[PDB]
Design a protein around this ligand. Structure first.
Ligand SMILES: Nc1ncnc2c1nc(Br)n2[C@@H]1O[C@H](COP(=O)(O)O)[C@@H](O)[C@H]1O
Ligand SMILES: Nc1ncnc2c1nc(Br)n2[C@@H]1O[C@H](COP(=O)(O)O)[C@@H](O)[C@H]1O
Ligand SMILES: OC[C@H]1O[C@H](O)[C@H](O)[C@@H](O)[C@@H]1O
Length: 453
């Protein structure tokens, strides 16, 4: 397969079409990300001062919400050991204070809503209508210029205004991002993949706080959009899910009634009652996006523990096991589209036939490579710089497996009445950071694919 030629042609095709989109609704979680680039000596001294044995215990136990500093350091170590992204609520004032003093190297726009708003609106030029729980001064300052809007109502009429006008009195919602590189060393551990641990320390996003005007006037807001991306459900628990999930179903009903194509961005959802609820919610979505650990966790709660294990047991996620999981998911939910992304390759399983599915995946992989290389995408010209990143060797090896097991040509084949679409990713050898690449991938492919028709 001439993947370099396909990548170049996909970039030009999507650039010609991407601005066609009338508008994209983004809800619900926006926050500020405070990013720390972990260093071995600093982490080792913090672990020693806190109690190494206790930290290690927490690095081998299932992460739960963080109440003590050993739990925090052990959850970071949990993520390093496995090269996996954990995200836990920091519910203790003492630990929030510890993290605040530990500090951050930079501040970035955070949350699925905010990251996709800055990309789709600030970079691609598509109008976005964004739900921001708390639009503090700092929160507002992290939005790019461009057609990014938050809804307001004046005498009953909808007015879209730019978010860099902050709302006086609303609070900063801080999430701490602890980034570590591939092969990061601490004690006798070494990270098998670049990744991060996220300590979520705000009081609005964990409960899926929704602003009153979105509760009252959702339909009027949603009419300004052609597509919707829904996120933020991952922190909910069996104890607090009732009110948020009830609202989300009401909004999804309106999106369905208006014919607005909706995409659910999955994040790892530890609470199994909420995780299964989200799987049931997918019966009202057109598209869903997820990675290898999320797919496994979903297949696991659908009664396929052995298959879930097969999905996460190999470093390049076992492509056959992944596809078996995607088939089970699309059959149970009836979604029209699943976009799977992992280290080395993406897969899509879709009702839609044709090359536009692959065009969108390749475009999104160019966006991912640029984001990995630069840390943040600032302008459309950045995406073309992703063409120089070489195609990873893992992706090419996975393609060989898929061509023996399926009838595939240039990444396209059939399973039952679905199209299977594969691409190998362009892998940056030393990325700056990883937070936000998933959002960049899922939003870029979902929106660009729609724009190609
Ligand atoms: N954020 C996260 N990412 C991946 N797996 C997670 C996770 N949080 C939890 Br809880 N897990 C769970 O951790 C298990 C994997 O643990 P090990 O990697 O120690 O085997 C998975 O079965 C998954 O359900
Ligand atoms: N160095 C790198 N170059 C290119 N893509 C990368 C990358 N590091 C990462 Br992480 N990515 C991509 O970013 C994706 C992030 O997905 P999650 O956040 O859902 O795990 C990965 O699946 C991988 O494809
Ligand atoms: O995609 C990255 C985002 O994931 C989650 O929403 C986190 O809570 C947030 O802090 C981060 O910016």
């Amino acid at each position: 397969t001439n993947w370099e030629s396909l990548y170049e042609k996909a970039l030009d095709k999507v650039e010609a079409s991407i601005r066609k989109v009338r508008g994209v609704l983004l809800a619900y979680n926006t926050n500020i990300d405070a990013i720390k680039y972990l260093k071995r000596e600093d982490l080792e001294k913090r672990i020693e001062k806190v109690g190494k044995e206790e930290v290690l215990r927490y690095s081998e136990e299932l992460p739960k919400e963080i109440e003590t500093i050993p739990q925090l350091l052990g959850s970071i170590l949990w993520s390093i050991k496995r090269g996996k992204a954990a995200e836990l609520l920091v519910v203790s004032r003492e630990v929030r204070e510890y993290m605040r003093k530990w500090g951050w190297d930079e501040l970035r726009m955070g949350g699925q809503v905010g990251i996709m708003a800055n990309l789709l609106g600030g970079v691609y030029g598509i109008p976005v209508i964004a739900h921001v729980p708390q639009l503090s001064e700092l929160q507002a300052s992290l939005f790019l210029d461009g057609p990014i809007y938050v809804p307001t109502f004046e005498r009953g009429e909808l007015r879209l205004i730019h978010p860099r006008e902050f709302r006086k009195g609303e609070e900063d919602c801080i999430h701490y991002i602890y980034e570590f590189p591939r092969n990061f060393k601490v004690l006798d551990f070494e990270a098998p993949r670049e990744n991060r641990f996220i300590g979520a320390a705000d009081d609005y996003n964990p409960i899926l706080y929704v602003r009153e005007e979105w509760i009252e006037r959702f339909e009027e807001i949603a009419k300004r959009s052609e597509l919707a991306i829904i996120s933020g459900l991952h922190p909910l628990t069996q104890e607090n899910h009732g009110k948020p999930i009830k609202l989300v179903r009401e909004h999804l009903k309106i999106l369905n009634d208006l014919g607005i194509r909706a995409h659910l961005e999955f994040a790892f959802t530890p609470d199994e009652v909420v995780r299964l609820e989200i799987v049931k919610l997918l019966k009202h979505f057109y598209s869903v996006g997820l990675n290898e650990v999320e797919l496994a966790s979903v297949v696991s709660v659908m009664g396929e523990k052995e298959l879930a294990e097969r999905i996460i047991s190999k470093d390049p996620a076992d492509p056959i096991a992944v596809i078996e999981g995607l088939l089970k998911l699309i059959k149970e939910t009836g979604v029209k589209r699943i976009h799977f992304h992992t280290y080395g390759y993406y897969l899509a399983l879709t009702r839609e036939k044709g090359e536009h599915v692959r065009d969108a995946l390749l475009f999104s992989a160019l966006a991912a490579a640029t984001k990995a290389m630069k840390g943040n995408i600032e302008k459309l010209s950045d995406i073309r710089e992703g063409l120089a990143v070489p195609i990873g060797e893992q992706g090419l090896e996975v393609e060989k497996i898929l061509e023996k097991e399926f009838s595939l040509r240039d990444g396209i084949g059939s399973i039952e009445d679905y199209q299977l679409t594969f691409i190998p990713t362009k892998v940056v050898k030393k990325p700056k950071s990883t937070v936000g690449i998933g959002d960049t991938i899922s939003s870029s492919a979902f929106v660009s694919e729609f724009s190609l028709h």
